[PDB]
Every structure is written in structure tokens, then in C-alpha cells.
């Protein structure tokens, strides 16, 4: 079998096969020499002497909040500090990408096609005699007995850092831009060839879908008015494929960005904020520019809600799920004067890992009712029954589950949370170790390190037999979380650089990009730089209901 | 019209229109301030004055022998000052890039659709009065008349670089893997959505077509044997698309990456050297790793080649034609410490630039033979006939023309010449002083400071009548060539940025790529850093005949 199975080589050490049982490891640029990488340089010895563990560095951000508060009052150390996160979270990530599922070493193949997931470690070769490489046994256990015995939820249990209706969703909607797996290929595919933050979920991902979508006038979109509310087309009306079950109404068939918003009115409802806000953007534009056709109406319109998503992701979204006292901040003129590439490519791994199905509650409810999963999906009917006002203040105000902690994936989504499962096991993910290993974590010697308690611990421990051979996914879903926290530590130091190098690494944040002349003047520079969750819908939501992610 | 349709805003300002008749420069981070960008900051103001010009500059790289000589064999040196080539040149160039034919504003469209060749100046508006903006006549001169006025050739004019047949050929070869327009939609379009060095015109473009051409054992790929030598497989054993006359012998449609290599001998002898080089890295691999597999074996060997195909061009190809004492050095390492971005998108004026038709000889020299371009064109008996080392000595020795200096391009190819101007005029590019101010170059103040003579320059102005609406393309041939030299300096100081960027700019350059496990071990990594145009055809080429990018 393949040499390289056992993953022998250790802190960023490339692993080659050197013969039928013989390998070699490449230690180049790592801090580390030796056959497998393990003999620390004398600088990088000083390094690791001086390195805080991450729940030290979470501790002091999550504490002291008025030391914080006069840090976030202070335009040179807040500038400082976001500095420092906007330039070491990324650094943990290949880019230009390298490996794929299909290929454990570097090609051209894997670089240049858009189609694939790139993948943060390569897949475990097919030969090897034991799923994770060496250790471990014959096979990983059921996915079903995993999934049932320490995923499912029995009592639902809330997030304690308030996270609502509002972020879960705005979560799903904002991350299925890039997260659009080509099924028709496989688990290991994308649709999604833009690999990033083009907001392709509101525009399209082919020119001919946008063209459909917009109106040709004012460089707005295409939109109905009912009941004096403004909504997206129809699929009849654009002639866009949307995914409806056969039994929906030709006049629910909301014609969108995304070819599946339709399924989730949690969804269709940013869906319609989103294209209220980009027309909102092409009146000031106009009267900013009489003399701007349609084409750059529109297209300048798009790049200011490129910036409004990436300044809202940041300041609000991020802000909030970090839990961290001190304010961050979205300004890309502080990775000016560092080395950082201007690119992006979306990982398998952070797509599993943001599978955050615990998040979701055992009902929707909204003004007075209580939906089901049943009653909810497939119905926008529910959407104008309502209208955006109240599905804002009624999601404002409902809570979330808590994601990591164990056993609070909902009985309705289960077939999801097993195919997560045995989808990484189809894409041949290295073990939860060696992902933690691969960003500077220290993997867990037992299951109870793991999930800091006893029960599910045992459960585990008769599961897989060893800590060694422990799944990522379903250990991101039964880590032991921070102290009143969402999430545990694997969960943040792994979607942590993921997610940063994803917006910074948007062509807008570079220095060419990132001047008032490429938004219209400073009159649409300052809508991105003001932007907020809360302004989002106090413009295209009628009444301006209170909004944010917790509560 | 459009009130930025004059160009007034400087030094890498934006301009924007905000009324009817109103227009807004954007000077941020140009060094610049007020309404069109044009006082200097004081540390500008500084810098220019110390800044040497370009002709200075090449004057001390194309002198003093004796003291290059010193400073190419000190490795701190050398090092030190091709890392200042390497930082300094491809800052000129928008990277993520920014304008296309059809944006001349910045836009998700222009960033995102590869199939577009991007700007580096955004095209002219529709709505404007003149051509080139508000200068100048109604309408550019005839194109016929430019091309043969100043274009043609009526004596053969041998280029005194000593540049010989075996640089022109690379430089068609090489260059049309990034160079693949998309006439089918326009001359902004391209068909190489790669954007650099990847070898499809060698391996395909598509998946589709590197599958036929591969024989899938030992990573190799397909060929047939010839008399006993190595040649590309046919269309007919691999159904590959290739660009073929009827009337052609099925033995001699040769099935390449790129279609359009049958079309002259010399390409296809740079493709049948390059797919025995593939198939020799091929064997020196399964030698090194027997437990590999076909794909691996491939893919391993393709990366090789690339290597191979960036050392040549930088330290043979790039160091003939810059005609430098200096020793420049293919090292990915000097960036490493430095800003830049592993990312590259092909530029429509790069592509304009490269336009090199009066390196064309008069006839083809092979043996003791002389071929017209009819009787050259689509023949690839020829090569066969004669061999890759009577193609290799013969090309060697055969001098090319001058690319600069006015009334060089062949007659046979006055057609190809003539479209270039006109698709230009279609891309609608900026002037000729436009893409010098672009580049921190000085505008002409005349026909005859560009020309540096009088007859010439003297047809160019009746034709255009300002210098300031001088078009680019016909400016580049008709240039005084720098002492000595094959360009002159609007070639140099343009092609170096776009060339440079698209060689660093690659995939294998970065830092997670630069390592001997990318490469298959130190083996396949040392192939790449001691690859030479002279290896390539001692490895590949019966004989081993010497082989050079100049005459001598
Ligand atoms: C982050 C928040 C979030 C929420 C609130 C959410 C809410 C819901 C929801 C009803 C509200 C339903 C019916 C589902 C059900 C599904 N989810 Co999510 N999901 C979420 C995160 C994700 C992500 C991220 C993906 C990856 C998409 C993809 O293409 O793989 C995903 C994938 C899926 C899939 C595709 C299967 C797969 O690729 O694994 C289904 C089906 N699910 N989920
Ligand atoms: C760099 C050296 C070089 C040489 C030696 C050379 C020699 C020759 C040659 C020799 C027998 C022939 C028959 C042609 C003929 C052509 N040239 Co060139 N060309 C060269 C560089 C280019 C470039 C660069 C383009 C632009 C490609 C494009 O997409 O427009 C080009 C375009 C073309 C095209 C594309 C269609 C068109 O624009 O009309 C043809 C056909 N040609 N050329
Ligand atoms: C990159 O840009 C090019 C040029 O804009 C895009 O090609 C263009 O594609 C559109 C639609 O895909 C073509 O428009 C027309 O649509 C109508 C539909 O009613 C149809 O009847 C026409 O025959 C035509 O298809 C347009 O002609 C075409 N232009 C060119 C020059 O090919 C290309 O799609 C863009 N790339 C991506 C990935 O979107
Ligand atoms: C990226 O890779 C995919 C999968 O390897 C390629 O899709 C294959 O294309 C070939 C030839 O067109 C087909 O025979 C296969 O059936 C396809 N496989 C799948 C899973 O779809 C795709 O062509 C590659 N992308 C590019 C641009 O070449
Ligand atoms: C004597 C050593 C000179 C350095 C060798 C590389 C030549 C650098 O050339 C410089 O490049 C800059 C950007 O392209 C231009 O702005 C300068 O005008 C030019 O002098
Ligand atoms: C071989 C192709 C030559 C075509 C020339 C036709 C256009 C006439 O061009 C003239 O040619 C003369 C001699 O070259 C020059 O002295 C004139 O400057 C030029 O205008
Ligand atoms: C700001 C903070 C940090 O550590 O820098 C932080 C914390 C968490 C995330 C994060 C975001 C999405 C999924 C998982 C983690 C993130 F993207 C950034
Ligand atoms: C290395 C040197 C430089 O001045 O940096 C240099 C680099 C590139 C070119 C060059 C110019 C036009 C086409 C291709 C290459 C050139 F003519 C000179
Ligand atoms: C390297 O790793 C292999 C397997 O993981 C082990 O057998 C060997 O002893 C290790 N060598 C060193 C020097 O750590
Ligand atoms: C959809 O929601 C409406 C409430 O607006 C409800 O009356 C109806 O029964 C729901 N449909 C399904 C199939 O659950
Ligand atoms: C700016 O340029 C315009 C036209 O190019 C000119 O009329 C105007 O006087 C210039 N303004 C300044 C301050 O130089
Ligand atoms: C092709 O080249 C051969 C020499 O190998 C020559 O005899 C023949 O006439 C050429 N064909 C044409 C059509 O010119």
C-alpha cells in the first residue's frame, strides 16, 4: 500500500512516495528538518517557547471588556490589533490552492479546475489499509450509530451567546454563494466557479441567469409588486430554473440568484432584501450619475453590495459569533503594506465544517404560529402571509441552538447530518488530528479531552476505538465549547482562516480596486463603508424593524 | 459626449465622469493631487528627479562589460539586482486586473469572465468625437497606407542583435499559448482562459483534448515514429482537431496541443521537441518512482516542463533579446520576501505588442534548400525530409529581421499586419503617447523624435497630423530602434511588465509550489533549474547540434 498512509511527515512537511515501501519527507520553508519534519530549528524553538495557546488568546479577547472598551476608542491600536488577525488567520492557508479529492499531490490539474473543492490536506490514499491510513480499524463505524448516539437532539439546546433566527439564516444565505456542490459530479465539486464572495446568489452564476434577472433599466433587477411590496419575478416571468417541488404554485416560483432559495422562506426573505437594496443603490447612483447608462448602474451597483456584504460579514456577523469584546474592523488598506495574495479558492473542509445543522430550532416561529420543518419548507406563501417586517422582528427575537456541545442536531434534517458523514468519508478525509495538527492545534489524546465530558465520551470511545481515527465533522458537532460559547476550539482555528482569506482575498479589497471611483464616486463608497445588518433592513424593510444577531 | 473622452486625468488617475459635462479624477495612491492628478507630493516630486530614465538605464546594463562581468559571478549581487527587475516591472501592472474591450470602468464582469483579454488602458468611448478622444482628425488614416508607407518591407533588414530563426520560431511557439484569440467573438476575446504559461499548446486546452493526445502508460504522451524518429501523432490515430488544408497527406496532419501549429514547420519542430522532452521526463520519473501511476507520472512531468519552459525563456529567450551584460537569473525565492501577486491575466495590448512579423525572414533556409512562405506553409514534409538537426543547425545560422526601425514586415504577411491596425482601431486603443504616460514613459513631441529620422516620419504626419493620436501598434515597428538593438524603447518598457508578470505570476513560483515534492524530488527539481535552450535540443534532437537564439 501507499508509503505515505500513516501521514508520517509532521508540521507542514510534504509527504513522496520514494519507492514500493519507502518514502520521503519535504521540510522546506516549515521551521523543521529531519526524516519526518520533527527536529525544530533554533528560531522556530524561541517561536513555539513564546506562542499562547488559542484559548488563552479567546480568553483575553473575550474578557477585560472595558480594557477593550478604551482599546476600540483608539484609532491606532484598533487599526493595530485587526491588523495582526487580518494577517496571521490567512497565512494557514494555501494560495495559490494546491490538492483536491482527486489528487493528494500538487498538478495542474488541481490548480487550474474550477470545478473542484480545493482541500486543505490531501485525500487518504485509496489503498490504504485502514480508512483513515494505518490506524483504526477495517472500517469507521456506522455513521447512523454516530449520528444517533452523540449528533441527534434530544432536548433542544440554545445558543448561550444569543445567536437568533436572523444569523442562522442570514449563515445559510450568505454561505450558499459559495458552497453550491455539483451533485452531478460529486461531493467534491462546486458550482460555484467564482470561489468566493461575487454575491452569484442574488446575480447569478452565468451571464445568461443574470440577464434573465434584470430589468435593463436604471441597471436594476427584475421584481414584482404585490400587495405594495416589493418581491423577486417569477420563474414564469425570467424563464429562470428554479428547484420547486411539482406542487408549487406558478406565483410562489420566486426567480432568484440561487437556484434552491426557494425551498427556505428564511431564505427568500434575504433574497428580497438583497434585491431591494440593490435597486435602493441604483436610485442614488442615478441621481449621483444622470449620465450612467443601465450596464454601469448595474455593475457598479454590484460591486457596492460586494463591499456591503463583505463590511456586514465582518463588523456584524463575524463580530458577533466571535464573541470577542474588541471591534473588528473592515478596512483593506491595513494589508497594504503586507504580503497577502488577492485570490481565493473554497475548501472541501470549510464547507463541512460550516454544516451548522444544530442551529436550526425544532420550529419556526413567526408573529404567532409555530411552522414545522413540514409547514415551512417549500412555502413562501408563509413569507406574504406575513410580510418581511414581521419575519424580521419575529427571527430577531428567536434563539438558535448551540452548534458544538453534542446532540442537538435536529431529528428533522438527520439524512443531512449522516450524508456530512459519509460524504467525507467518500471524499476521503484525513482524521479530526490531523486537520487539528495541520493548524497548529494540539491534537486530543482521549475522547473526554474532546468532548470535556463522560457520557459521549464512552459513546465514542466504543465507536472508533481510538482518539487517533476520530472523524472531523462530528467532532466539530460534539466538542466541548468555550465557556459559554457556540462553538470549540477546532471549529474557530479552522473557519477562523477560512473565512478572512475568503473576503479580504475578494479583488475588491485590493488596492486597485479599493478607491471611491470604482463605487461611483465617495457618495457609493460610503454606503459599503457604513453598511450594517441593522441598516440593511432599516432601508428595504418597511418600518425599519430593530434587528441583529443575538437576542 | 463623454467628458473623460480627452484623457485628463494623470499619472495613473481614474477618471469619472459626474454630469453630462462634467468629469472627477481619482488620485488615490498615485502620488498626485489636484482636479486632474498632476502636483506632485513632495516625496514625488523627490523621486522623480532622482528616477534615471529608461535609455539611461539600458545604456548602463548594455555597458561596461568588464564590471557585469564582476557582478554576475558575486551570487549576493546578482541576486540583489535581479530581484530589483523582478519588483520593480510587473508593478505597472494591474493585478487583480481591472479594464476589458467592452469596460472602461471597473466592473465584476471584466474581473470575472476569462474570456476576455484584459486592458491595461481601458478602451475609448463610444460617444467620442475623434477616434482617439477629442485630438486629431474625424478618422485615423487608411490603414493600408500606414502599412505600406512605413510597414513594409522593400529591402530585407537584418536585426544587428543577431537574433536568428530559432528565436523568432520560439517566440511564435511560446507565445501562442497565452496568445489564442477568439475570432469568433472578437479580437478582445481570447480561448487560452489559462492566462500564462500552462503548456495547452502542448497538453490542449481542454481535458477533452489532452485525453487523445495522451497514450496513458507511463504518464506519457501519444506519438508515432517516423523513419525512425519521433513525431506527433495524426488526427486520424487520436481525433484531434487540428487546423489542416484538405489536400493534406493523413501521415502529415500532426496532432498537437495547439490547432494551430501544422501551419508552419517551425512550430511544429518546437512541439515534436517538447513532446520528447515530456516523454523523456516520462522515463527519467518511472526510473526515480516505479510505484507511480500513469496520472502522476504525467501531471509530475507537465509541472517539469513548465519549469523548464519559465528557466528557458527567462535566461536564454528574455536575456538574448534584452541584450544585457547582466546575467538575469530565474530564482522564485527573490520574491518571496516581497510583495506580488501569483496571479496573471493576459493584456490585449501585450498581445498587440507581440506582433513581431518583421522577424519573418524572406525565404526559410533549410540545408541547401530555400522555401518561399507558399511553399512553407502546412508543409511538414519538409521537416521530415531534412529532420529536427538539419532544422535545428540551419535555423541556428539563419538570421532574423529587425522588429523596430521602420518598413520590415513581409509582403506575405501584409495582411496580418494590416488587421492588426484595424483591430485595434475596433478594441478601440488609446494613443501611441498614451501607453508611454501609462508606463512612466516621456511623450513623443514629434514624428521625428519617435522615427529618430525624416522620411518616415515626415508620410506619419501627413497621415495623422498629431503625434499625440500616433497609433500603438504601428509606433512599435516604426520606432528608432535603441543602438544596435532589435526594439526600441516602447517595446522594451511595456513588454517587460506584462512578460515578467506572466512568468513569476505562476502557480509553481509560489512558495507552496517551489518545492522538490511538487516536482517528484530533487530529480525532477534539478531538471528544471538547469534547463537551457541548448539542453532542450541536446536531449531531444539527434546529433545534439549546437544551438543558440543568436547567429554570432
Ligand atoms: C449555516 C447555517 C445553515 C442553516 C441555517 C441550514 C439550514 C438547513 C435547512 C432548513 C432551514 C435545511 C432543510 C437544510 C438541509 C441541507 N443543508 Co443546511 N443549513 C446550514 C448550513 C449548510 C451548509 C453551509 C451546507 C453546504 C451546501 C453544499 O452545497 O454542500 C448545507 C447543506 C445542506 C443540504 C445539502 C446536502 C449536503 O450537501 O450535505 C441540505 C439538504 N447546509 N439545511
Ligand atoms: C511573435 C512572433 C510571431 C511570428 C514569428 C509570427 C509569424 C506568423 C506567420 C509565419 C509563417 C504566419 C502565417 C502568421 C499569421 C498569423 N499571425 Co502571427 N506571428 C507572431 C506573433 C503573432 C501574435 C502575438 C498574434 C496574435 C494572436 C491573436 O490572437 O491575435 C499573431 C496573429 C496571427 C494570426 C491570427 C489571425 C489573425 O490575426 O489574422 C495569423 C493567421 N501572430 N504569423
Ligand atoms: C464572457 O463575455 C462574453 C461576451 O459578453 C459572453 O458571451 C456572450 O454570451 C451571451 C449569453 O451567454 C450571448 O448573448 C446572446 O443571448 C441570447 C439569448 O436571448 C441569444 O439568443 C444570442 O444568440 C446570444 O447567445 C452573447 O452573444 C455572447 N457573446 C459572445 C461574444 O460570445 C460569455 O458568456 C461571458 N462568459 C461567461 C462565463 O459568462
Ligand atoms: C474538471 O474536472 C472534471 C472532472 O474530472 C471534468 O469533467 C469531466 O470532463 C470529461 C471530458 O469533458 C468527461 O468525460 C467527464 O465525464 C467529466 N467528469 C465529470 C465528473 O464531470 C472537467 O472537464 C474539468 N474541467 C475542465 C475545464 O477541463
Ligand atoms: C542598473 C540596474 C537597473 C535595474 C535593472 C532592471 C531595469 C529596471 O528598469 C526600471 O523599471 C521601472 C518599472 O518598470 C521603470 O519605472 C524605470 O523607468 C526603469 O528604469
Ligand atoms: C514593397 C512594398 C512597397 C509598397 C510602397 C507603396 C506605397 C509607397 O510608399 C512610398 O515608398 C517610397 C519608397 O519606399 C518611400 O520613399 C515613401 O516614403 C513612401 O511613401
Ligand atoms: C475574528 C475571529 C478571529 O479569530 O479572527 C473569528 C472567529 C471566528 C470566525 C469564524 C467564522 C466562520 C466560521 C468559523 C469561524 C472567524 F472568521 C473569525
Ligand atoms: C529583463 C528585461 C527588463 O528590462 O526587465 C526585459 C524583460 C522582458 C522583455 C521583453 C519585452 C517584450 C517582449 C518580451 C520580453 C525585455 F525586452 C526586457
Ligand atoms: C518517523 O516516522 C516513522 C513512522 O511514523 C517512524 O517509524 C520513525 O521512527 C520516525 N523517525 C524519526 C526520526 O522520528
Ligand atoms: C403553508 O403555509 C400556510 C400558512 O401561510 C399554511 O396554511 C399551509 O398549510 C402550508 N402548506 C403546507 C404544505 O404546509
Ligand atoms: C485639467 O485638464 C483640462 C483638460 O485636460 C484642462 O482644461 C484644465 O485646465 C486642467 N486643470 C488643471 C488644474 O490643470
Ligand atoms: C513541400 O515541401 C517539399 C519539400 O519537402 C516540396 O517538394 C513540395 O513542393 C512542397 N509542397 C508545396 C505545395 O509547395
Same mark, same amino acid.
Given at each position: 500500500?501507499? &508509503?505515505?498512509?500513516?501521514?508520517?511527515?509532521?508540521?507542514? $512537511?510534504?509527504?513522496?512516495?520514494?519507492?514500493?515501501?519507502? +518514502?520521503?519527507?519535504?521540510?522546506? *520553508?516549515?521551521?523543521?528538518?529531519?526524516?519526518?519534519?520533527?527536529?525544530?530549528?533554533?528560531?522556530?524553538?524561541?517561536?513555539?517557547?513564546?506562542?499562547?495557546?488559542?484559548?488563552?488568546?479567546?480568553?483575553?479577547?473575550?474578557?477585560?471588556?472595558?480594557?477593550?472598551?478604551?482599546?476600540?476608542?483608539? &484609532?491606532?491600536?484598533?487599526?493595530?490589533?485587526?491588523?495582526?488577525?487580518?494577517?496571521?488567520?490567512?497565512?494557514?492557508?494555501?494560495?495559490?490552492?494546491?490538492?483536491?479529492?482527486?489528487?493528494?499531490? @500538487?498538478?495542474?490539474?488541481?490548480?487550474?479546475?474550477?470545478?473542484?473543492?480545493?482541500?486543505?490536506?490531501?485525500?487518504?490514499?485509496?489503498?490504504?489499509?485502514?480508512?483513515?491510513?494505518?490506524?483504526?480499524?477495517?472500517?469507521?463505524?456506522?455513521? @447512523?450509530?454516530?449520528?444517533? @448516539?452523540?449528533?441527534?437532539? *434530544?432536548?433542544?439546546?440554545? !445558543?448561550?451567546?444569543?445567536?437568533?433566527?436572523?444569523?442562522?439564516?442570514?449563515?445559510?444565505?450568505?454561505?450558499?454563494?459559495?458552497?453550491?456542490?455539483?451533485?452531478?459530479?460529486?461531493?467534491?465539486?462546486?458550482?460555484? /466557479?467564482?470561489?468566493?464572495? !461575487?454575491?452569484?446568489?442574488?446575480?447569478?452564476?452565468?451571464?445568461?441567469?443574470?440577464?434573465?434577472?434584470?430589468?435593463?433599466?436604471?441597471?436594476?433587477?427584475?421584481?414584482?409588486?404585490?400587495? $405594495?411590496?416589493?418581491?423577486?419575478?417569477?420563474?414564469?416571468?425570467?424563464?429562470?430554473?428554479?428547484?420547486?417541488?411539482?406542487?408549487?404554485?406558478?406565483?410562489?416560483?420566486?426567480?432568484?440568484?440561487?437556484?434552491?432559495?426557494?425551498? #427556505?422562506?428564511? %431564505?427568500?426573505?434575504?433574497?428580497?432584501?438583497? /434585491?431591494?437594496?440593490?435597486?435602493?443603490?441604483?436610485?442614488?447612483?442615478?441621481?449621483?450619475?444622470?449620465?450612467?447608462?443601465?450596464?454601469?448602474?448595474?455593475?457598479?451597483?454590484?460591486?457596492?453590495?460586494?463591499?456591503?456584504?463583505?463590511?456586514?460579514?465582518?463588523?456584524?456577523?463575524?463580530?458577533?459569533?466571535?464573541?470577542?469584546?474588541? @471591534?473588528?474592523?473592515?478596512?483593506?488598506?491595513?494589508?497594504?503594506?503586507?504580503?497577502?495574495?488577492?485570490?481565493?479558492?473554497?475548501?472541501?473542509?470549510?464547507?463541512?465544517?460550516?454544516?451548522?445543522?444544530?442551529? %436550526?430550532? !425544532?420550529?419556526?416561529?413567526?408573529?404567532?404560529?409555530?411552522?414545522?420543518?413540514?409547514?415551512?419548507?417549500?412555502?413562501?406563501?408563509?413569507?406574504?402571509?406575513?410580510?418581511?417586517?414581521?419575519?424580521?422582528?419575529?427571527?430577531?427575537?428567536?434563539?438558535?441552538?448551540?452548534?458544538?456541545?453534542?446532540?442537538? #442536531?435536529?431529528?428533522?434534517?438527520?439524512?443531512?447530518?449522516?450524508? =456530512?458523514?459519509?460524504? =467525507?468519508?467518500?471524499?476521503?478525509?484525513? =482524521?479530526?488530528?490531523? +486537520?487539528?495538527?495541520?493548524?497548529?492545534?494540539?491534537? +486530543?489524546?482521549?475522547?473526554?479531552?474532546?468532548?470535556?465530558?463522560?457520557?459521549?465520551?464512552?459513546?465514542?470511545?466504543?465507536?472508533? =476505538? !481510538?482518539?487517533?481515527?476520530?472523524?472531523?465533522?462530528?467532532?466539530?458537532?460534539?466538542?466541548?465549547?468555550?465557556?459559554?460559547?457556540?462553538?470549540?476550539?477546532?471549529?474557530?482555528?479552522?473557519?477562523?482562516?477560512?473565512?478572512?482569506?475568503? /473576503?479580504?482575498?475578494?479583488?475588491?479589497?485590493?488596492?486597485?480596486?479599493?478607491?471611491?471611483?470604482?463605487? $461611483?464616486?465617495?457618495? $457609493?463608497?460610503?454606503?459599503?463603508?457604513?453598511?450594517?445588518?441593522?441598516?440593511?433592513?432599516?432601508?428595504?424593510?418597511?418600518?425599519?424593524?430593530?434587528?441583529?444577531?443575538?437576542?
Amino acid at each position: 500500500h501507499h &508509503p505515505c498512509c500513516s501521514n508520517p511527515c509532521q508540521n507542514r $512537511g510534504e509527504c513522496m512516495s520514494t519507492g514500493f515501501d519507502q +518514502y520521503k519527507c519535504d521540510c522546506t *520553508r516549515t521551521g523543521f528538518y529531519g526524516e519526518n519534519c520533527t527536529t525544530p530549528e533554533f528560531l522556530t524553538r524561541i517561536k513555539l517557547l513564546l506562542k499562547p495557546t488559542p484559548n488563552t488568546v479567546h480568553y483575553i479577547l473575550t474578557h477585560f471588556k472595558g480594557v477593550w472598551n478604551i482599546v476600540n476608542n483608539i &484609532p491606532f491600536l484598533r487599526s493595530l490589533i485587526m491588523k495582526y488577525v487580518l494577517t496571521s488567520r490567512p497565512y494557514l492557508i494555501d494560495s495559490p490552492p494546491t490538492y483536491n479529492v482527486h489528487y493528494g499531490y @500538487k498538478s495542474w490539474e488541481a490548480f487550474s479546475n474550477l470545478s473542484y473543492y480545493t482541500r486543505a490536506l490531501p485525500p487518504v490514499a485509496d489503498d490504504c489499509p485502514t480508512p483513515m491510513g494505518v490506524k483504526g480499524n477495517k472500517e469507521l463505524p456506522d455513521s @447512523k450509530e454516530v449520528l444517533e @448516539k452523540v449528533l441527534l437532539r *434530544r432536548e433542544f439546546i440554545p !445558543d448561550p451567546q444569543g445567536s437568533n433566527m436572523m444569523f442562522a439564516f442570514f449563515a445559510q444565505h450568505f454561505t450558499h454563494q459559495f458552497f453550491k456542490t455539483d451533485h452531478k459530479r460529486g461531493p467534491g465539486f462546486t458550482r460555484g /466557479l467564482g470561489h468566493g464572495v !461575487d454575491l452569484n446568489h442574488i446575480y447569478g452564476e452565468t451571464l445568461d441567469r443574470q440577464h434573465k434577472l434584470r430589468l435593463f433599466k436604471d441597471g436594476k433587477l427584475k421584481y414584482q409588486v404585490i400587495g $405594495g411590496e416589493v418581491y423577486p419575478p417569477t420563474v414564469k416571468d425570467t424563464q429562470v430554473e428554479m428547484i420547486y417541488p411539482p406542487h408549487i404554485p406558478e406565483n410562489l416560483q420566486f426567480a432568484v440568484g440561487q437556484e434552491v432559495f426557494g425551498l #427556505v422562506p428564511g %431564505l427568500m426573505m434575504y433574497a428580497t432584501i438583497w /434585491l431591494r437594496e440593490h435597486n435602493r443603490v441604483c436610485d442614488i447612483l442615478k441621481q449621483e450619475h444622470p449620465e450612467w447608462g443601465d450596464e454601469q448602474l448595474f455593475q457598479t451597483s454590484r460591486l457596492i453590495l460586494i463591499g456591503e456584504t463583505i463590511k456586514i460579514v465582518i463588523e456584524d456577523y463575524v463580530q458577533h459569533l466571535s464573541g470577542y469584546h474588541f @471591534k473588528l474592523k473592515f478596512d483593506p488598506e491595513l494589508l497594504f503594506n503586507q504580503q497577502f495574495q488577492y485570490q481565493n479558492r473554497i475548501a472541501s473542509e470549510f464547507n463541512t465544517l460550516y454544516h451548522w445543522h444544530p442551529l %436550526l430550532p !425544532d420550529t419556526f416561529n413567526i408573529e404567532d404560529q409555530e411552522y414545522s420543518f413540514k409547514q415551512f419548507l417549500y412555502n413562501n406563501s408563509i413569507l406574504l402571509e406575513h410580510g418581511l417586517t414581521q419575519f424580521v422582528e419575529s427571527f430577531t427575537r428567536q434563539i438558535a441552538g448551540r452548534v458544538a456541545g453534542g446532540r442537538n #442536531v435536529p431529528i428533522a434534517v438527520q439524512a443531512v447530518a449522516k450524508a =456530512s458523514i459519509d460524504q =467525507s468519508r467518500e471524499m476521503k478525509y484525513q =482524521s479530526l488530528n490531523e +486537520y487539528r495538527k495541520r493548524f497548529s492545534l494540539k491534537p +486530543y489524546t482521549s475522547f473526554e479531552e474532546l468532548t470535556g465530558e463522560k457520557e459521549m465520551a464512552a459513546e465514542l470511545k466504543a465507536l472508533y =476505538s !481510538d482518539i487517533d481515527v476520530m472523524e472531523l465533522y462530528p467532532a466539530l458537532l460534539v466538542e466541548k465549547p468555550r465557556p459559554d460559547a457556540i462553538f470549540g476550539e477546532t471549529m474557530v482555528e479552522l473557519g477562523a482562516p477560512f473565512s478572512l482569506k475568503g /473576503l479580504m482575498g475578494n479583488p475588491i479589497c485590493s488596492p486597485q480596486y479599493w478607491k471611491p471611483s470604482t463605487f $461611483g464616486g465617495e457618495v $457609493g463608497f460610503k454606503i459599503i463603508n457604513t453598511a450594517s445588518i441593522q441598516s440593511l433592513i432599516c432601508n428595504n424593510v418597511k418600518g425599519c424593524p430593530f434587528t441583529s444577531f443575538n437576542v
